[PDB]
């Protein structure tokens with residue numbers, strides 16, 4: 001797949017904030033989250049998450065934030081024909 | 093005369109963070125406040141904000157999705173000088 005593009009916006013003693021910009025069909029690659037994190041979606045739409053429990057399609061809504069814990073392990077894919085963006089705030 | 097209030101909606105409030113969506117009517121403001129925590133601002137709207145601090149007033153240009161951080165201790169009033177609603181998500185980091 002094409003690669004999603006992470007841009008780190010903030011990396012201080014308290015948080016690391018990364019913008020993830022997905023081209024259509026783009027993926028993060030598999031990773032494991034080492035920190036609790038908050039997601040602020042900048043786009044409304046579905047994401048495809050490959051997870052240890054299998055494939056999960058999730059609905060994100062622009063401007064509706066949510067949090068997930070340290071230990072989440074997955075590959076995130078943009079299953080749409082448009083760009084998808086979200087901001088991820090990892091708590092240190 | 094009084095500017096309309098910006099409206100806070102708490103999205104997350106847990107051991108680690110408090111995340112509040114702030115929605116500004118046209119011309120709207122926060123009122124003066126003091127930030128008790130380091131915080132992250134994720135703008136949801138591209139546009140100017142007018143920031144009133146003890147020393148003066150400045151126009152700051154925000155871009156949707158371009159975050160920034162400010163430290164504990166900020167004292168200000170924040171105003172939306174535009175003719176349309178301005179929205180940002182504020183992530184306060186608990187100690």
Ligand SMILES: [Zn+2]
Pocket residue numbers: 028031033074076
């Ligand atoms: Zn992830």
Ligand SMILES: [Zn+2]
Pocket residue numbers: 122125127168170
């Ligand atoms: Zn403030």
